[PDB]
Structure formats: structure tokens, C-alpha cells
Design a protein around this nucleic acid. Sequence first.
DNA 1: TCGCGCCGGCGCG
DNA 2: TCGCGCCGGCGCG
Lengths: 290, 290
Amino acid sequence: TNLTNSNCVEEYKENGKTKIRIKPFNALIELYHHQTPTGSIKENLDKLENYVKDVVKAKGLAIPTSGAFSNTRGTWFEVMIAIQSWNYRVKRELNDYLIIKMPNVKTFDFRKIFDNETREKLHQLEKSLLTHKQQVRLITSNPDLLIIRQKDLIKSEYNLPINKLTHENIDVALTLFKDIEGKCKWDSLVAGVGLKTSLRPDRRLQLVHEGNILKSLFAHLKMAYWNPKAEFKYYGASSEPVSKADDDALQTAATHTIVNVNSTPERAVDDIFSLTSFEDIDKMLDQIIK
Amino acid sequence: TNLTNSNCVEEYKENGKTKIRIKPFNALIELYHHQTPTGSIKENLDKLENYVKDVVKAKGLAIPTSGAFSNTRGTWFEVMIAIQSWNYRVKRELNDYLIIKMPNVKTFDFRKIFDNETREKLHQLEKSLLTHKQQVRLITSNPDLLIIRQKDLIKSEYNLPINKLTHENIDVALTLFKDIEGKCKWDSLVAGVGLKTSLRPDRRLQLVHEGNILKSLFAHLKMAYWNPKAEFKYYGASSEPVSKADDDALQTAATHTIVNVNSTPERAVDDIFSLTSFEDIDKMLDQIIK
DNA sequence: TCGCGCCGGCGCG
DNA sequence: TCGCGCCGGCGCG
């Protein structure tokens, strides 16, 4: 029952004071180093949170703020999803798919996945958009999850499953994006997913912005390569129940598709998934892919 | 120095426990009942926050959570802006403008401001968007601030300035939206503003969604009334410094304007204002209006 | 009851 | 240092 030797929380100094820092990956390793998480997702998140709370208590330290936990829970959910997605393509034996948890736009802009030709197409768009009196851009956060269909990206090292959470295992899932840098043909990118532990009426609209901007960059590519068949879909996924009001908001259109009376309107977010269990991650990936 | 008789915090029961509730309007009245706020905005917000914090301390009660303050600060800033905007149109003598702090989409959907003819134009769009296999919508939060140019809406009661914050004064500013219900011609709506005490890379993109959706509803109206001259602009306003990265994000395009090579692209958010002082609110309104 | 729309406090490079 | 992108906890009808 000894919790005082845990490293899921770290001490550091700032302005002559000792401060507390949650180490979200350490919490995952210290709970899941023999087996990867199973059952209800939300409960595992609360379990991890109550674990760090017990640790700080046992060490006699100040409880981390709600913001620290907001941040921390976001990472847990993403890593749970990234690991489950890694194992999905192994057990399904998807020789030509990758599901990749992306870092932030500054560490690695998702545009860097694309081959030289496609990056130049996007550079032409970006540069022309700035060639006006009123300069415009197309900025969004990196998608949390990207689904890429390209057979020659898959190496045999990806075909070893993750049965336990180590520093080494979490590292490989979270640096997967590095292997595909400058290698994806434009239509290899088939889907992205936004991952949220919970939704708010304000925060759910960030999923619409994301889908809208991504589908707008993709529609440019479809015209630059005059391909009417290639599709890019954008999805949402919550760990909580999704309400009617959440559902309506996320039916919102990618606005460039609704200008004309005889256009068929596209949703910016094609579907929203309520991931109750780890089995639901597999279910979600089944729908997105097949 | 007696803080124990203050009503800026309220006690209420929930599951056999006594809970604390900030009363954000009471905090404003108890600080500004002789004169309306002046000087630096951010400092007045911190002043109001430190006032309720001193009150709970003096009463020996639990300090409200950061979420309670997040909520509370949002209301203070909006009311400060609403009151300053009320006084702006008086001192400028804008006989044909109203600046209105809107409630939420459920209390009063901003679409209800419009006259019967324009509401039917939007109902045709909404209903047709649902008349597909994949149903789509155009959902956003209500704009925080709306600027309406229509001379016949202005009554003489609006021309009395607000020199002190009472329950009665805050009520009139915050129910102003009720007077214009079903009265605005479509092109009377000239601007909306999103008001934020601070920005985040995620949260600032909600201003882009808002602008994008609003300009998409307005572009429909421009076509339904075949008017190439009518404009609707969308603006942001922070109480903190705005960074280069905030600036870039909010240069993002209303995506329906960038489809074609010879389109002139429009920003979804036309400008972002950093409101340091109350004088800056006046400055901002000067640019938006004239 | 919950729906709305608010925003602060992160861990990490 | 700050930029990224995370999300919980509201007051109110």
C-alpha cells in the first residue's frame, strides 16, 4: 500500500517556493506496467486521478489544481486511445493503415507528413492567401489522431503489440509521426479524430473549426489533383455520454459546401463517438476505416 | 472595512451540505454603485475578484473554485463592456445605432432579432440543409455583442447614461435585446463582437467558428436579397495583450470565400482588439462603427 | 435537471 | 519564456 515511493508527482522550485507537478506518463506506467488498461474508460481516468491524489496525500503535499488535472486527464485519454489504436491495426492486420497520435502544431505541423509535391500545393495556397490587402490564413490545432492509408509506410516493428505501458512503449506510440515525415501522398490521409474527455457547448465547436479547416485544405488538394473520388473525413470522440445538443452542434456544415442551392452539404465533423469502453475504440475504428 | 455584510457571495444547500455561490452582479453593485468603473480593465477584474475573496475570508467560508471565478470574470467583463457601450452611443449621440449584450442561444437565439421576412429566408436555408441523407446545420454560440444600425429602434430612454451600477441599471442593459425582437431588417445587423478576458490557442479558434458561421448565414441573406453592398463584420476583443500567434490564428479565413482562385478572401474575424482601458472600448467602437 | 457559454491552470518542449 | 492544446467547475434560467 506504499504510495510515498511513487513518481506520478514531481517537486520543483519557482520563486523560492516548492511546487507540485503531475507526471501523467509515470502515473500510467505505475498502474499499467503489467497489463494495458481495460473496461470502462472514464473509470480508468478517475482511477488514475484518484491514484495521484492518494500519492500527494501520502506524501503530505498540496493537491494539484483542477487545471493540472484537466491537462493530465487529456493526456491519459490520448495515450489510452493511441495505444489501443496501435493494437487495433495489429490484431486486425491492417497492412496499409496507420493510426497516429499527433503532437502539437509547433513540435510537428501535420502538414509535414506530406510529400514535397503536396506541400508545395499547400504553400501555393498559403502564399496566395497572404497576397491580398487583407491577409488571411488557414490555422487550426493539430488533429489529435490521424488515419493514414499508405502501404509502404508500414514496417514490421509496428506489428508487435503493446501489452504493457513502459517509458519505451509510450515513446514509440508518441513519436510514430516522425517515421512518416515527408512521405504521405495527399490522398493517403483519410481521416482525423478529435479526442475529448468531456464536451462543453463552447469547446465542442472547436471540433467544427478543425473539421472545417482540414476539409478546406483537402478540397484545395482535390482540385489541384482534380480528383473527385478522394475523401477526407473528420470525427469527434468523447469519453462521456454525447447529448442531443452535442449532436446538433456537431452536425454543423463545412461552410464552403453550402454556398449553392444544388450543392450537397457536408458536415465539418462526420460523426461523434461516445467511447464508454476500450471495446468502443475498436468499434469506432471499424466504422472510420471500414 | 466591514466585509461580512456583503452579498457578493451566497450560501445554498446541496445534498445536505452548505455550498458557496458568487453573485457577480452583487459584486459589481457593491463596488460601483456611486461611479461606473474606470482606468485599467484587467485591474478592475482582479479588484472585483480580490473583493469577493476578502468577503469569503472575512465570513470564514470556503474560497470559490477557479471555475467559479472563470465564470464570474466572464460576466464582469461583459457587463463592463455592455455599460461602456451603452454610454458610448449616448455621448457620441448615435441616433441610429444600438450596441447590445446578447444572452445565450436558448434564452434568446439572436436570429429572433430579425423581421418575419428575414427569419423565413433563414428557415428556408435551415430546412433545406436538413433535407438531405446527411443532415447538416449551422450552429454557433450567440455573439456576445451585437451592433445594429436601424434608426427606428432607438427610443429616448436609451439616451439616459449609466453613471452608477444598480440592479435596475444592469437589468436594462442586459434585457436590451428584448426591445428589438422581430424588428431588425437583415442589413441592419452590421457587426458582432466576441469578448474574452483572456485567450488560449484552443479557445481563440471559437472566435473563428463564430465569425465563419455568422458570415455564412449573412452571405445567404446577401444572395436572397441580391445585395452586394451590405456587410457584416466580426470582431474579437481581449482584456489581455494579444500576441503574434493570437493574431495569426485570427487571420484565418471564412472558408466559403477561398474556394476559387480569383475570390478575394475574407477573414472570419476582421480584427482582434486588446482592451487595456475603458478608453479602449470607446476606441474599438470608433473603428467598428466609423 | 441540465444547457449555455464563461475561462483559468496546467505538463511539456 | 512562452506556445500548444488540454478540460473541469461554474451562475443563471
